Design a protein around this ligand. Structure first.
Ligand SMILES: *Cc1cc2c(cc1C)nc1c(=O)[nH]c(=O)nc-1n2C[C@H](O)[C@H](O)[C@H](O)COP(=O)(O)OP(=O)(O)OC[C@H]1O[C@@H](n2cnc3c(N)ncnc32)[C@H](O)[C@@H]1O
Ligand SMILES: *Cc1cc2c(cc1C)nc1c(=O)[nH]c(=O)nc-1n2C[C@H](O)[C@H](O)[C@H](O)COP(=O)(O)OP(=O)(O)OC[C@H]1O[C@@H](n2cnc3c(N)ncnc32)[C@H](O)[C@@H]1O
Ligand SMILES: COc1cc(/C=C/C=O)ccc1O
Ligand SMILES: COc1cc(/C=C/C=O)ccc1O
Lengths: 525, 525
């Protein structure tokens, strides 16, 4: 049965499709069940089908984006913009509201508009992937490096717009975003910062421009369709060295985090964004669950021990990268060893010292931390059949007690619902993104359902403990936004007021981050 | 006669004043011409009077701020919030719209709410000055340092809200701002980021929270009255060293900037925010204009040579600070000498080597760059009698040709309008704030008008060359915003739409950054 935009009839929809085809060309509007299967969430959550798109439109220019938007306003059709649509763990390309049209900006708006060697930046269309950018930089023998997330097939823009992260010193992607072009919800185009000044060369040089600074408002947001974005690029250092610290016990988490803080808060000796990964995360990247335990339930303790012993890893594995001339790297590594070697059982390895299977994550982090994109982490999804993940991503103080509490709260529900808890703490200067990846068999309805129910429980329980998520799945956006309800929902109300003013017809990605325009509020969508 | 809010009668204003007194106390509402003289622009611009407050209200708490806002909605009274109201150069405490009531939040909301040593942050009310924070840090023997502007009497909050700058590695104040509380234009209170999650300890740890990130929209803005703000604070390094490089010729500017960029863009060896100051800036900091020249018109070349020789300074004077272990400092300083030494006539002094009158600026920079607040730069205002200044503050690429172009363009008009051009380039990673400070005799109506006309021409002319200002004076806000008119004034249209949705009655600082609510649009005040 045909997915349609809410309250839009089969023929009003057919009319709009034709209008879209006039803008973008026939090839670039998809609308059949078979074409649309590929734009469903690849890692579905919940037993019931959700997040169904009614069509995909692929514009080639900003002007085409403005025309699609205007058409959409005329018909009341919701539009859900994506760049490359690889937001897996959080919905993939699928819209929050069933029946919305995906605007897949990145299919043809994929140009590298500028890479400036002198000032260290790029101006990009949404379709540029980390692999694309890396190839450009290699080809031109650039002195610049990118900063990539774990999987390079996403979009430099797309990822920044969801405030995604990577692992070099430029790991906070939104922090390095400088300038954007956006189509607002009625079709007007606007440039932020110095791009609002006609003829300025400083769009990618000074982010703020003049007056109220809005670029943040277009991240985790449904206020427009972004068409161009700048990002600062770091200079490649002359030398780098990555390392692994293995820690034997579950219980070491607290001491690892407490030792780490003072070595990280000033960006030295911990220069890059360290990651702290549990054995579940690291074993799934190199092996199948059945290698260690056949059995539908929680993995017993001896099977955990064998994971550790066979891969020669700890329960907790700390990965970091140092940059600079070699004498600096040695001084900083020396400090890291001295500090973390206070933990009994800690062992250290550089990227030159492990060529075994357990060392494969280290080699992969060594690429990622040097801005070399990779797809090796896709192997996580082979942990179980028809493997999917969801990201439960609370923020934590860089405090060992708080990290242990979150770990324990999540582990306990993971056990109750029969899901493996793979953990990656992504360590900022003053906070950690505690990413909890739950790998599961996307073909079993009941696994899909337990995932949904488990993660709903974790959102509420984390909030009752004072913890919020940095980012979340379509399925949890309402639940997550409901937690940020200080002052009787003041934040949500503010966002709705802005949304309604910029988008009086309720066109752009309704429900993104729990923000619903007026015509959809109070409904069960 | 009495300054009254536009469209508001004596009788209604009297009623509104009494209601303000009900909220804050009789003593905390000022309304006589005598009491209000202190809230006039201390550096008035334009011959004609402008920017006249109708009153000043000083609330004690967020709750009183809410109550005030409610009252002003009911009566149609415009409110102009300040923290300490020391925005000298840009208007002081004076409101953009004459007749507005100033809400001086900092008079009584002046607590340090939290300084967290472990995570390196403060949570502040608006009345905390840089002096007050420095004192607290000193008294508690903190390992943290603050980052201050040139004058320490302003507000950590207020300064940040105008996207002000300082000179340590944390010199971009807005970058380090983390969390805020704001009273919206109809009286509702909101917290941003992790502060929107009840019980979170991460308000000052993770800036973004969940969903669209709004904090920027409260900077250079009239969308609410901020009542609390957090800021990250850097750890004090073990050692530091400041230096001065003097360069003999006006024309050295191009090469100085070109040599500088590769040393700045990686944050090393130029670790702090370097400043490049011209001789008029430096001479005004330690001497009066009549020591060098007492004729009519622009100072002649021979008199400029005398300033340089007597103070032992260059036409351009570069100040920087290095931080870290001593051998790191020496290695960086060596790199700096070697790079800038290419410029014929360059001379180098550290803060340990110069204690003379000309070295007074270096000593002041060595305090400021180590987070020790100062009022020594108030001496600039003694350059001429009744001295005041205005900041004309274009953004520059960190490119020598661009900086030279800006310099020549500004110099040409400075000479034409007989105003001395003191320049301070404030050097970020990828951009410079080129602060053109014109010091003038505020008593003379011709001088004030010439300042006004000159700056209007500079705004226009800079924009014709593709240059825009980062911040500006009350008197230039409409002109500066009119320059950011890409896409047919798209940016301003966006702002007005938000302004009208949040502030339906047009209450908060109408005209800030050229953003006027609907009721004032087109009235020419
Ligand atoms: C499964 C998984 C996921 C993952 C990861 C490891 C694994 C095994 N590691 C990640 C990491 O290290 N860091 C990180 O930030 N994310 C990581 N993920 C999650 C995900 O794969 C990536 O973040 C991915 O890069 C995101 O996908 P993409 O880059 O393709 O972005 P998108 O889906 O197009 O868009 C994301 C959302 O942003 C808004 N958006 C995007 N484009 C626009 C435009 N043009 N206009 C308006 N809004 C836009 C939409 O909300 C969209 O849903
Ligand atoms: C004359 C001068 C000025 C100067 C300077 C040197 C001289 C000789 N050096 C500066 C520097 O190195 N860096 C810098 O950023 N500014 C410099 N200036 C200019 C000025 O002195 C300082 O910026 C000063 O710190 C600013 O004044 P203050 O800190 O008192 O800020 P304010 O007047 O209260 O507020 C400024 C504007 O911000 C908005 N505002 C402020 N508080 C609020 C609240 N609570 N809510 C909403 N908006 C707020 C208003 O727009 C206000 O006008
Ligand atoms: C799904 O969401 C995320 C995954 C990862 C990385 C996981 C390990 O490869 C990081 C940040 C995220 O938000
Ligand atoms: C008036 O505005 C400014 C002054 C200064 C510094 C002046 C030199 O003492 C820096 C930044 C500004 O925006």
């Amino acid at each position: 049965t045909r997915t349609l935009p809410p309250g839009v009839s089969d023929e009003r929809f057919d009319a709009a499709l034709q209008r879209f085809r006039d803008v973008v060309g026939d090839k670039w509007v998809l609308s059949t069940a078979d074409e649309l299967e590929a734009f469903r969430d690849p890692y579905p959550v919940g037993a019931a089908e959700a997040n169904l798109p009614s069509a995909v439109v692929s514009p080639e220019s900003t002007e085409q984006v403005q025309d699609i938007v205007r058409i959409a306003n005329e018909y009341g059709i919701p539009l859900s913009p994506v760049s490359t649509g690889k937001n897996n763990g959080y919905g993939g390309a699928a819209p929050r509201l069933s029946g919305s049209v995906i605007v897949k900006t990145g299919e043809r708006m994929n140009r590298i508009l500028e890479v400036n060697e002198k000032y260290g930046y790029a101006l990009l269309e949404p379709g540029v992937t980390y692999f694309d950018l890396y190839e450009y930089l290699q080809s031109h023998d650039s002195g610049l490096m990118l900063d990539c997330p774990d999987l390079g097939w996403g979009s430099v823009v797309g990822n920044t717009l969801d405030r995604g992260v990577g692992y070099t010193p430029y790991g906070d992607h939104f922090m390095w975003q400088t300038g954007l072009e956006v189509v607002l919800p009625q079709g007007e185009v606007m440039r932020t910062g110095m791009g609002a000044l006609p003829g300025s060369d400083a769009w990618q040089l000074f982010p703020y421009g003049f007056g109220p600074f809005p670029d943040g408002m277009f991240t985790q947001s449904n206020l427009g369709i972004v068409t161009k974005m700048g990002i600062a690029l770091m200079q490649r250092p002359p030398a780098s060295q990555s390392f692994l610290i293995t820690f034997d016990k579950e219980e070491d988490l607290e001491q690892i985090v407490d030792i780490m803080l003072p070595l990280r808060i000033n960006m030295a000796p911990l220069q890059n964004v360290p990651v702290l990964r549990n054995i579940f995360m690291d074993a799934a990247a190199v092996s199948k669950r059945t290698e260690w335990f056949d059995g539908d339930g929680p993995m017993p303790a001896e099977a955990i021990e064998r994971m550790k012993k066979d891969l020669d890893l700890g329960f907790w594995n700390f990965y970091g990268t140092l940059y600079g001339p070699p004498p600096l790297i040695e001084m900083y590594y020396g400090m890291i060893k001295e500090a973390f070697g206070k933990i009994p059982g800690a062992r250290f390895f550089t990227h030159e010292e492990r060529d075994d299977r357990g060392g494969h994550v280290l080699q992969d982090r060594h690429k990622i931390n040097n801005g070399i994109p990779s797809l090796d982490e896709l192997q996580l999804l082979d942990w179980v059949p028809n493997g999917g993940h969801i990201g439960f991503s609370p923020v934590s103080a860089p405090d060992g007690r708080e990290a242990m509490k979150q770990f324990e709260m999540v582990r306990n529900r993971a056990n109750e619902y029969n899901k493996d808890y793979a953990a990656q703490f992504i360590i900022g200067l003053r906070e950690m993104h505690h990413v909890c990846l739950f790998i599961y068999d996307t073909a079993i309805p009941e696994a899909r359902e337990e995932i949904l129910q488990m993660t709903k429980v974790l959102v509420r329980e984390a909030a009752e403990a004072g913890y919020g998520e940095y980012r979340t799945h379509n399925a949890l956006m309402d639940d997550v936004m409901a937690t940020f309800n200080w002052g009787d929902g003041a934040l949500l109300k503010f966002h709705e007021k802005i949304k309604d003013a910029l988008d009086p017809n309720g066109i752009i990605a309704p429900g993104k981050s729990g923000i619903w325009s007026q015509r959809f509020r109070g409904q069960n969508l």
